[PDB]
């Protein structure tokens, strides 16, 4: 950004500062808030198993760690909805069971495990 000589700060549409000028050396710094989001637990009923998967939504999981075991446990799979931990990626496509989002569903199947796949709209047919 190209400040004028007499300007110091920089503001946004909603009046939130997003750029500053270093007082000692005259340069421009852009400010970005560090990440946040909610945590989601994907589980089949406790009647079936005590195993779960965790979704950190809206976070690029190059920095997930910051219970910890489900922070580097058995995988870190990146999806458009966030980082999924504890579930294994398959290549088949079935009907949706538990909706995760952005086109990704998850289910519990085979020695059992939790799988995440891309939902399928239906069979193909040519008339």
């Amino acid at each position: 950004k190209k400040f004028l000589p007499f300007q110091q700060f920089g503001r946004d549409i909603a009046d939130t500062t997003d750029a500053v000028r270093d007082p000692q050396t005259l340069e421009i710094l852009d400010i970005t808030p560090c990440s946040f989001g909610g945590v989601s637990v994907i589980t089949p009923g406790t009647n079936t198993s005590n195993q779960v998967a965790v979704l950190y939504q809206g976070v690029n999981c190059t920095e997930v760690p910051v219970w910890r075991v489900y922070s580097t446990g058995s995988n870190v799979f990146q999806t458009r909805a966030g980082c999924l931990i504890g579930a294994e990626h398959v290549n088949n496509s079935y009907e949706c069971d538990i909706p995760i989002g952005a086109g990704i569903c998850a289910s519990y199947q085979t020695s059992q495990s939790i799988i995440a796949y891309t939902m399928s709209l239906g069979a193909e047919n040519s008339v």
Binding site: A14, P33, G37, R80, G101, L121, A123, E124, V127
Partner: protein, 428 residues
Amino acid sequence: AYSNNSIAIPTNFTISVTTEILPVSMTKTSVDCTMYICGDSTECSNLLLQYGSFCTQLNRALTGIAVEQDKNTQEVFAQVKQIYKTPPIKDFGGFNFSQILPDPSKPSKRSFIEDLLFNKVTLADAGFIICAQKFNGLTVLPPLLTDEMIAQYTSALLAGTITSGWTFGAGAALQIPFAMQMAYRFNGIGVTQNVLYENQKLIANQFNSAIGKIQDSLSSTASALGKLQDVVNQNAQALNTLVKQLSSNFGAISSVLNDILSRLDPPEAEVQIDRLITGRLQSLQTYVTQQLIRAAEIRASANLAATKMSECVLGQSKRVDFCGKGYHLMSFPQSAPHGVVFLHVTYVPAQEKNFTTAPAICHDGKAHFPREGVFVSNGTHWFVTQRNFYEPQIITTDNTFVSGNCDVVIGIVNNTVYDPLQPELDSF
């Protein structure tokens, strides 16, 4: 020009295509309560803990709305359990569907008109719907069905409709040539079917021209999609004012929590922080209430759209003005950002004339009524025609039926009814 022995009957027709636009869903959004009200300040949180479960109620409400949106979309679009596809040969009897069928020459397999619709909608704010996170505890969630799956559903519906008729909505798709399907569609609105087979390419040309004019009217005019645009506008505006309410005083000393904390003692900063948290809580509640009301409106619109998809597309409707103005023939769907667009194809008459009429005909002391049609006279002779297209025929005993004598009907005329068996017996 009313009168009690005068009727007007059309002589030509016109095929018209019109558009209808409906919203279906809106943006899912979630809000963090403790971070919005006062973030990074522990002292404030201990004060906030004295109000109980307000934040939980807010979160539950927003989650309910978020789920209902995906429910709406699935109700509207997912009405077929197979994915049909059109054959590679395009012998459709003269009609030209090239402008609504998919185009595999694109990263997303959308048709021409869908591309126009997706380019007309513009959003003023940037990055308010891979990053999605707002300044203060505000987040937007992605929908469950990408924009590339909805296009597949629409393509399946179109292919099924143009290859199988209305039989794929009641069971298993059964194929049928397009010309015969259109003949049945005319038969459904009271016009004999030999009116199509003898006027086929005229109808094809009219249909093609109508589609062309639709393309122009979409690509030139700008204010077609207002209904879809104002939804985005309202959502952006509400979010904007929410964020903007963080720079007010509400009666306290300053709007920055750190300045109140770092200028007073804890026995006085409390009386200021309380005012601040009260104001911000009130703002949040106002936001969620307005969102609930808007969600109700959108749900009503989505239900209407689902009904139209069920009855105009998968069949042929008799309800007047439900599926466009005129006599309904058929309809086609298209997708658009946050909504759906229907193209209705309908029938309108033209070139009416003047004839004199009568309710019955006393032939031989017997009253003859028309089986299906109406009696007309061109000035000297009497014919019997169908009610929706001028086509006269001789009056015989096969298209009329007898009931009683002819001294009770008001306005009965004399004329001869020719008997087909009479010459077969006389020439014999």
